[PDB]
Coordinates of C-alpha atoms and ligand atoms in Angstrom, one line a residue:
Chain A
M1 CA -25.2 105.9 41.9
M2 CA -27.0 106.9 45.0
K3 CA -27.7 110.8 45.9
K4 CA -29.2 112.4 48.8
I5 CA -31.8 115.0 47.9
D6 CA -33.5 117.7 50.2
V7 CA -37.3 117.5 50.5
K8 CA -39.6 119.8 52.3
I9 CA -42.8 118.2 53.6
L10 CA -45.5 120.9 52.9
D11 CA -48.5 119.0 54.1
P12 CA -48.2 117.5 57.9
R13 CA -49.9 114.1 56.6
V14 CA -47.0 113.3 54.4
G15 CA -44.8 111.2 56.3
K16 CA -47.9 110.0 58.4
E17 CA -51.3 109.3 57.0
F18 CA -49.7 109.5 53.4
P19 CA -46.4 107.6 53.5
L20 CA -43.3 109.4 52.0
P21 CA -42.3 107.8 48.6
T22 CA -40.0 104.5 48.7
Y23 CA -38.1 102.2 46.9
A24 CA -40.1 98.8 47.0
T25 CA -36.7 96.9 46.4
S26 CA -33.1 97.2 46.3
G27 CA -33.2 97.2 42.7
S28 CA -36.2 99.2 41.8
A29 CA -35.9 102.0 39.5
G30 CA -38.5 104.3 40.6
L31 CA -40.5 105.6 43.6
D32 CA -44.2 105.8 44.1
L33 CA -46.0 109.0 44.5
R34 CA -49.1 109.5 46.5
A35 CA -52.2 111.8 46.0
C36 CA -52.5 114.2 48.9
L37 CA -56.2 115.0 49.0
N38 CA -58.7 115.6 51.4
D39 CA -61.7 113.7 49.7
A40 CA -61.6 111.6 46.6
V41 CA -61.9 112.9 43.2
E42 CA -64.0 111.2 40.5
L43 CA -62.4 111.4 37.1
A44 CA -64.7 111.0 34.2
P45 CA -63.5 109.5 30.8
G46 CA -61.3 112.2 28.7
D47 CA -61.1 114.7 31.7
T48 CA -57.7 115.7 33.4
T49 CA -57.4 117.0 37.2
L50 CA -54.0 118.5 39.1
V51 CA -53.3 116.2 42.1
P52 CA -51.0 117.8 44.8
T53 CA -48.3 115.7 46.6
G54 CA -47.6 117.7 49.8
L55 CA -44.0 118.0 49.0
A56 CA -41.3 119.8 47.3
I57 CA -37.9 118.6 46.5
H58 CA -34.4 120.4 45.5
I59 CA -32.3 118.2 43.3
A60 CA -29.7 121.2 43.1
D61 CA -27.1 119.4 40.9
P62 CA -27.4 120.4 37.3
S63 CA -26.4 117.1 36.3
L64 CA -29.3 115.3 37.5
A65 CA -33.3 115.5 36.6
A66 CA -36.3 113.6 37.5
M67 CA -38.9 112.2 35.3
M68 CA -42.4 111.5 36.5
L69 CA -44.4 108.4 34.7
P70 CA -47.7 106.8 34.7
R71 CA -48.0 103.7 36.7
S72 CA -48.0 100.3 34.7
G73 CA -51.3 98.9 36.2
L74 CA -53.2 102.3 36.5
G75 CA -52.5 102.7 32.7
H76 CA -53.0 99.5 31.3
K77 CA -55.8 98.3 33.3
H78 CA -57.7 101.5 34.1
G79 CA -56.5 104.2 31.7
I80 CA -55.2 106.4 34.2
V81 CA -52.1 108.1 33.2
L82 CA -50.6 111.8 33.0
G83 CA -51.7 114.8 31.1
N84 CA -48.3 115.9 29.9
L85 CA -47.5 112.2 29.4
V86 CA -44.3 112.5 31.4
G87 CA -43.4 115.2 33.8
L88 CA -39.8 116.7 33.6
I89 CA -38.5 118.0 37.0
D90 CA -35.7 120.7 36.9
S91 CA -32.7 120.6 39.1
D92 CA -33.3 124.3 40.3
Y93 CA -37.3 123.7 40.7
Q94 CA -38.3 124.1 44.4
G95 CA -42.1 124.1 44.2
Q96 CA -44.5 121.8 45.3
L97 CA -44.3 118.4 42.9
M98 CA -48.0 118.4 41.2
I99 CA -49.4 115.7 39.1
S100 CA -51.4 116.1 36.0
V101 CA -53.7 113.0 36.1
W102 CA -55.6 112.2 32.7
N103 CA -58.3 109.3 32.1
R104 CA -57.6 108.1 28.5
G105 CA -60.2 105.4 28.8
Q106 CA -63.8 104.8 28.7
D107 CA -64.4 104.2 32.6
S108 CA -64.8 106.7 35.3
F109 CA -62.3 106.4 38.0
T110 CA -62.3 107.5 41.7
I111 CA -58.7 109.0 42.9
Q112 CA -58.5 108.1 46.4
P113 CA -56.3 110.3 49.2
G114 CA -53.2 108.4 49.6
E115 CA -53.2 106.3 46.7
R116 CA -49.9 105.7 44.7
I117 CA -50.8 107.5 41.2
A118 CA -47.6 108.0 39.7
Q119 CA -43.8 107.1 39.9
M120 CA -40.6 109.1 39.7
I121 CA -37.1 108.2 38.2
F122 CA -33.8 110.3 38.6
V123 CA -31.6 110.2 35.6
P124 CA -28.5 111.9 34.6
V125 CA -28.8 114.8 32.1
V126 CA -26.5 116.5 29.9
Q127 CA -26.6 120.3 29.1
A128 CA -25.9 120.9 25.3
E129 CA -24.1 124.0 23.7
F130 CA -24.8 124.3 20.0
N131 CA -21.9 124.5 17.7
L132 CA -23.3 125.9 14.2
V133 CA -21.9 124.2 11.2
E134 CA -22.3 124.3 7.2
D135 CA -22.2 120.5 7.1
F136 CA -21.6 117.5 9.1
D137 CA -19.1 114.6 9.0
Chain B
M1 CA -21.8 117.1 32.2
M2 CA -21.7 119.4 29.5
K3 CA -21.3 118.8 25.6
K4 CA -20.7 120.8 22.4
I5 CA -23.3 119.3 19.7
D6 CA -22.8 120.2 16.1
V7 CA -26.3 121.8 14.6
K8 CA -27.2 122.8 11.2
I9 CA -29.7 125.6 10.4
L10 CA -32.1 124.7 7.5
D11 CA -34.2 127.7 7.4
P12 CA -32.8 131.0 7.4
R13 CA -35.7 132.1 10.0
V14 CA -34.2 129.8 12.9
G15 CA -31.9 132.1 15.1
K16 CA -33.6 135.1 13.8
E17 CA -37.4 135.6 13.7
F18 CA -37.8 131.9 15.6
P19 CA -35.3 131.9 18.3
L20 CA -32.6 128.9 18.5
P21 CA -33.6 126.5 21.5
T22 CA -32.0 127.8 24.9
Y23 CA -32.0 126.5 28.4
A24 CA -34.2 129.1 30.5
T25 CA -32.0 128.8 33.7
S26 CA -28.3 127.4 34.7
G27 CA -30.5 124.4 36.3
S28 CA -32.8 123.4 33.6
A29 CA -33.1 120.0 32.1
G30 CA -34.6 120.7 28.8
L31 CA -34.5 123.3 26.0
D32 CA -37.6 124.5 24.3
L33 CA -38.4 123.6 20.6
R34 CA -40.2 126.0 18.3
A35 CA -42.8 125.5 15.3
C36 CA -41.0 126.4 11.9
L37 CA -44.2 127.4 10.1
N38 CA -45.1 129.8 7.4
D39 CA -49.0 130.4 9.0
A40 CA -50.7 129.0 11.7
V41 CA -52.0 125.5 11.8
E42 CA -55.7 124.7 13.4
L43 CA -55.6 121.4 15.1
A44 CA -59.0 119.9 16.0
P45 CA -59.6 117.3 18.8
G46 CA -58.3 114.0 18.1
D47 CA -56.0 115.1 15.0
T48 CA -52.1 114.9 14.7
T49 CA -49.8 117.2 12.4
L50 CA -46.2 117.1 11.6
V51 CA -44.5 120.4 12.5
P52 CA -40.8 121.2 11.3
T53 CA -38.0 122.9 13.6
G54 CA -36.0 124.0 10.6
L55 CA -32.6 122.4 12.2
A56 CA -30.7 119.4 12.4
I57 CA -28.6 118.1 15.0
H58 CA -25.6 115.7 15.1
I59 CA -25.0 114.1 18.5
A60 CA -22.3 111.7 17.3
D61 CA -21.2 110.1 20.5
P62 CA -23.1 106.8 20.7
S63 CA -23.1 107.2 24.3
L64 CA -25.7 110.1 24.4
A65 CA -29.2 110.3 23.0
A66 CA -32.2 112.9 23.0
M67 CA -35.7 112.9 23.9
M68 CA -38.3 115.1 22.9
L69 CA -41.3 115.4 25.5
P70 CA -44.6 117.5 25.7
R71 CA -44.5 121.0 27.4
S72 CA -46.0 120.6 30.9
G73 CA -48.7 123.6 30.3
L74 CA -49.7 122.7 26.9
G75 CA -50.1 119.2 27.9
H76 CA -52.1 119.8 31.2
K77 CA -54.0 122.8 30.3
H78 CA -54.4 122.6 26.4
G79 CA -54.1 119.0 25.8
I80 CA -51.5 119.4 23.4
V81 CA -49.1 116.8 23.3
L82 CA -46.7 114.4 21.0
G83 CA -48.5 111.8 18.7
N84 CA -45.7 109.3 19.4
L85 CA -45.7 110.2 23.3
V86 CA -42.0 110.7 23.3
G87 CA -39.7 111.0 20.5
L88 CA -36.3 109.3 20.6
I89 CA -33.4 110.9 18.7
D90 CA -30.4 108.5 17.8
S91 CA -26.8 109.7 18.1
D92 CA -26.2 108.9 14.0
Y93 CA -29.6 110.7 13.0
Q94 CA -28.7 113.8 10.9
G95 CA -32.0 114.8 9.2
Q96 CA -34.4 117.8 10.0
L97 CA -36.0 117.3 14.0
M98 CA -39.7 117.0 13.2
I99 CA -42.4 117.0 16.0
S100 CA -45.5 114.8 15.9
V101 CA -48.1 117.3 17.6
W102 CA -51.2 115.6 18.7
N103 CA -54.6 117.3 20.4
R104 CA -55.7 114.4 22.9
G105 CA -58.4 116.8 24.3
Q106 CA -61.9 118.4 23.5
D107 CA -60.8 121.8 22.3
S108 CA -59.5 123.1 19.0
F109 CA -56.0 124.5 19.3
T110 CA -54.3 127.0 17.0
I111 CA -50.5 126.1 16.5
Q112 CA -48.7 129.5 15.5
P113 CA -45.5 130.1 13.9
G114 CA -42.2 130.4 16.5
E115 CA -44.5 128.8 19.4
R116 CA -42.5 126.6 22.0
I117 CA -44.3 123.5 21.2
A118 CA -42.0 120.5 22.6
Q119 CA -39.0 120.1 25.0
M120 CA -35.9 118.3 24.4
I121 CA -33.3 116.7 26.9
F122 CA -30.1 114.8 26.4
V123 CA -29.4 111.5 28.4
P124 CA -26.6 109.0 28.4
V125 CA -27.8 105.7 27.0
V126 CA -26.1 102.2 27.2
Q127 CA -26.2 99.8 24.3
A128 CA -26.9 96.4 25.5
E129 CA -25.4 93.1 24.2
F130 CA -27.8 89.9 25.2
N131 CA -26.1 86.9 26.9
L132 CA -28.5 83.9 26.2
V133 CA -28.8 81.9 29.3
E134 CA -31.0 79.0 30.5
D135 CA -31.6 80.5 34.1
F136 CA -30.7 83.7 35.9
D137 CA -29.3 84.1 39.7
Chain C
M1 CA -21.3 102.4 27.8
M2 CA -21.6 99.1 26.7
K3 CA -23.3 96.3 28.9
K4 CA -23.9 92.8 28.6
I5 CA -27.6 91.8 30.0
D6 CA -28.7 88.1 30.4
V7 CA -31.7 87.1 28.6
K8 CA -33.9 84.0 28.5
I9 CA -35.8 82.9 25.6
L10 CA -39.6 81.8 26.8
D11 CA -40.8 81.1 23.3
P12 CA -38.7 78.9 20.9
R13 CA -39.6 81.1 18.2
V14 CA -37.6 83.9 19.5
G15 CA -34.6 84.1 17.5
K16 CA -35.9 82.2 14.9
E17 CA -39.4 83.0 13.1
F18 CA -39.3 86.3 15.6
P19 CA -36.0 87.8 15.2
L20 CA -34.4 88.7 18.6
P21 CA -34.1 92.6 19.2
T22 CA -31.3 94.4 17.4
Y23 CA -29.6 98.0 17.3
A24 CA -30.2 98.9 13.5
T25 CA -26.9 100.9 13.5
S26 CA -23.8 101.5 15.6
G27 CA -25.5 105.0 16.8
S28 CA -29.0 103.7 17.4
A29 CA -30.2 104.5 21.0
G30 CA -32.7 101.7 21.2
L31 CA -33.7 98.1 20.1
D32 CA -37.1 97.2 18.4
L33 CA -39.3 94.7 20.5
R34 CA -41.5 92.1 18.2
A35 CA -45.0 90.9 19.0
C36 CA -44.9 87.1 20.1
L37 CA -48.3 86.1 18.6
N38 CA -49.9 82.9 17.5
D39 CA -52.3 84.9 15.2
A40 CA -52.9 88.5 14.2
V41 CA -54.9 90.6 16.9
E42 CA -57.3 93.3 15.5
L43 CA -57.2 96.3 17.9
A44 CA -60.2 99.0 17.3
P45 CA -60.0 102.8 18.4
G46 CA -59.5 103.3 21.9
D47 CA -58.8 99.7 22.9
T48 CA -55.9 98.2 24.6
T49 CA -54.3 94.8 24.6
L50 CA -51.5 93.2 26.2
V51 CA -48.7 91.7 23.9
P52 CA -46.1 89.3 25.0
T53 CA -42.6 89.2 23.7
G54 CA -41.5 85.8 24.3
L55 CA -38.6 86.8 26.6
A56 CA -37.2 88.0 30.0
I57 CA -34.1 90.0 30.9
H58 CA -32.0 90.5 34.1
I59 CA -30.4 93.9 34.2
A60 CA -29.0 93.3 37.5
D61 CA -27.1 96.2 38.1
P62 CA -29.0 98.7 40.2
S63 CA -27.2 101.7 38.4
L64 CA -29.4 100.8 35.1
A65 CA -32.8 100.6 34.1
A66 CA -34.6 100.2 30.5
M67 CA -37.6 102.3 29.2
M68 CA -40.1 101.0 26.5
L69 CA -41.3 103.7 24.0
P70 CA -43.8 103.9 21.0
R71 CA -42.3 103.4 17.6
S72 CA -42.4 107.2 15.9
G73 CA -43.9 105.7 12.7
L74 CA -46.6 103.5 14.4
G75 CA -47.7 106.2 16.7
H76 CA -47.5 109.6 14.4
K77 CA -49.0 107.6 11.4
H78 CA -51.3 104.9 12.9
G79 CA -51.9 106.2 16.5
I80 CA -50.5 103.0 17.9
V81 CA -48.5 103.9 21.1
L82 CA -48.6 102.2 24.8
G83 CA -51.4 102.2 27.1
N84 CA -49.1 103.0 29.9
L85 CA -47.5 105.6 27.8
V86 CA -43.8 104.6 28.8
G87 CA -43.0 101.4 30.4
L88 CA -40.2 101.2 33.2
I89 CA -38.2 98.0 33.8
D90 CA -36.5 97.5 37.1
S91 CA -33.0 96.1 37.4
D92 CA -34.4 93.2 39.5
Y93 CA -37.3 92.3 37.2
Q94 CA -36.7 88.7 35.8
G95 CA -40.6 88.2 34.5
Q96 CA -41.5 88.2 30.6
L97 CA -41.5 91.8 29.1
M98 CA -44.9 92.5 28.3
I99 CA -46.2 95.4 26.1
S100 CA -49.3 97.4 26.9
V101 CA -50.4 98.3 23.3
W102 CA -53.0 101.2 22.9
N103 CA -55.0 102.6 19.7
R104 CA -55.1 106.3 20.4
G105 CA -56.6 107.1 17.0
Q106 CA -59.7 106.4 14.8
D107 CA -58.5 103.7 12.6
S108 CA -58.7 100.1 13.4
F109 CA -55.2 98.4 13.3
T110 CA -54.2 94.8 12.8
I111 CA -51.3 93.8 15.2
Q112 CA -49.3 90.7 13.3
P113 CA -47.0 88.2 14.8
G114 CA -43.3 89.2 14.5
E115 CA -44.2 92.9 13.9
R116 CA -41.8 95.6 15.8
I117 CA -44.4 97.2 17.9
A118 CA -42.2 99.3 20.4
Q119 CA -38.6 100.3 21.1
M120 CA -36.6 99.8 24.4
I121 CA -33.5 101.9 25.7
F122 CA -31.4 101.2 28.7
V123 CA -30.4 104.6 30.5
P124 CA -28.6 105.0 33.9
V125 CA -30.9 105.7 37.2
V126 CA -29.9 107.1 40.3
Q127 CA -31.4 106.0 43.8
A128 CA -32.4 109.0 45.6
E129 CA -32.6 109.2 49.5
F130 CA -34.4 111.8 51.1
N131 CA -32.9 114.3 53.6
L132 CA -35.9 116.2 55.4
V133 CA -35.4 120.2 55.7
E134 CA -37.3 122.9 56.8
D135 CA -36.1 125.3 54.2
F136 CA -33.7 124.9 50.8
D137 CA -30.7 127.0 50.0
Ligands
LIG201 O1 -45.6 117.2 35.6 C1 -45.0 118.1 36.2 C2 -44.1 118.8 35.3 C3 -43.4 119.9 35.9 N1 -43.5 120.0 37.4 C4 -42.7 121.2 37.6 C5 -41.2 121.1 37.7 C6 -40.5 121.8 36.8 O2 -39.3 122.1 37.0 C7 -41.4 122.9 36.5 C8 -41.7 123.3 35.2 O3 -42.3 124.6 35.2 P1 -42.3 125.2 33.7 O4 -42.7 126.6 34.1 O5 -41.1 125.3 33.1 C9 -43.4 124.4 32.8 P2 -44.2 125.2 31.3 O6 -45.4 126.0 31.8 O7 -43.2 125.7 30.5 O8 -44.8 124.2 30.6 O9 -42.7 122.4 37.0 C10 -44.3 119.4 38.0 O10 -44.6 119.7 39.3 N2 -45.1 118.4 37.4
LIG202 O1 -40.4 112.5 17.4 C1 -39.3 112.2 16.6 C2 -38.8 111.1 16.6 C3 -37.7 110.6 15.8 N1 -37.1 111.6 15.1 C4 -36.0 111.3 14.0 C5 -34.9 110.9 15.2 C6 -34.6 109.6 14.9 O2 -33.2 109.0 15.1 C7 -35.3 109.1 13.7 C8 -35.8 107.7 13.7 O3 -36.4 107.1 12.5 P1 -36.6 105.8 12.2 O4 -36.8 105.5 10.8 O5 -35.9 104.9 13.1 C9 -38.4 105.7 13.0 P2 -39.4 104.4 12.9 O6 -40.0 104.6 11.3 O7 -38.8 103.2 13.0 O8 -40.7 104.4 13.6 O9 -36.2 110.2 13.5 C10 -37.9 113.0 14.9 O10 -37.2 113.9 14.3 N2 -38.8 113.2 15.7
LIG203 O1 -44.7 98.2 30.1 C1 -44.3 97.6 30.9 C2 -43.9 97.8 32.3 C3 -43.3 97.2 33.2 N1 -43.0 95.5 32.9 C4 -42.4 95.0 34.0 C5 -41.2 95.6 34.4 C6 -41.3 96.2 35.6 O2 -40.0 96.1 36.4 C7 -42.5 95.1 36.3 C8 -43.2 96.4 37.3 O3 -44.3 95.7 38.1 P1 -44.9 96.5 38.9 O4 -45.7 95.1 39.7 O5 -44.1 97.4 39.8 C9 -46.2 97.5 38.3 P2 -47.6 98.2 39.0 O6 -48.6 97.3 39.1 O7 -47.4 98.8 40.2 O8 -48.1 99.3 38.4 O9 -43.2 95.1 35.2 C10 -43.4 95.2 31.8 O10 -43.0 94.2 31.3 N2 -44.0 96.2 30.7

């Protein structure tokens, strides 16, 4: 399925100097998120920093969620992943999307303004209601 | 979609001193899981410990699964994540839900009884059957 | 739901000495991926290595994706996880499936040929189109 999602641009560079997230191909599962920074940030081995995106989304449909994931190349080659490992975005969240960037490797890394630093997928979710039982089938 | 899921309470504190997992809002994607412990557990930097939840679920429908994820604040601010990174819960699993808690940071952390230590989402899954071919389209 | 997925065997050991991935039970969410290696690989604490699977898939339907995850036992007990944490497989990717294996613990680990080293789930995905607004509801 396809879905239109309302988005608010919070920093006027988003959609200009810092491109809006896009799907690379018709068959891509995820879109790439970019670092909305004024200057580069040096991240030493072991350290975590919070990177803004300059945007907010409103998924609004409670049957849908988004998940933020590391990029494959950054993660495998540079040890640049997420501090919370995976970021879960609720359908009712309307704040700025923030990225927890963590250096899990041994080499210092320069995070540049505008760099694709994470990816984000939209997946269907189910809200569970618990039915208390003494035994299962 | 919404789904009723059978759950068995294994420790009589679950639903009393240790609240049952709940969705914070109507639009939340995940519910928070709590540590079912008799006493606090100190987790040093680099170490992993297995934390019980005091409950079992039976999803039962093979078109559904659950995934356990770190909490955002614990992960980003405290370096408190999962040892297996993401925990996959099969539709036919009927054992106690166990949480692999890992300190990926530099500061020792006290895991308290009743603390929300992870989150869990229910997602649709597809069972694949492989069709062997010499070439793709 | 169930789905047939085209797969190409790239190494003639896959389906013979190295079994093809299978679901353990009718209710399993994921299938296990095996290391397609000529000889064992020793992975020291902190290090990452790229392990081939000897196969390619073509999901082809843009409403579906796959995610590669650590195994629970390897991750919790041995500190053997993924360097990119979670691996996202696009519906239009036709290359060999590669696994980023990372030792996040303190003990050296021997990766053997044919060993189940990761798992893979197929999940529905939604392609988002962004609708720019001044304010949300
Ligand atoms: O990586 C993330 C994760 C969550 N978020 C947003 C989206 C979520 O819906 C919202 C969750 O906030 P909570 O207060 O529920 C996180 P907690 O402090 O409980 O760990 O934060 C991000 O911007 N980046
Ligand atoms: O974090 C987790 C992950 C799995 N589990 C449960 C739910 C799964 O369906 C079940 C999987 O057990 P396996 O024996 O398949 C894990 P393996 O030893 O193969 O790595 O364990 C947890 O309680 N916590
Ligand atoms: O763990 C992984 C992740 C991706 N892949 C494949 C499947 C993806 O569709 C493809 C993505 O390649 P990209 O060039 O988009 C990754 P990037 O270099 O942008 O980080 O790589 C793997 O084989 N293993």
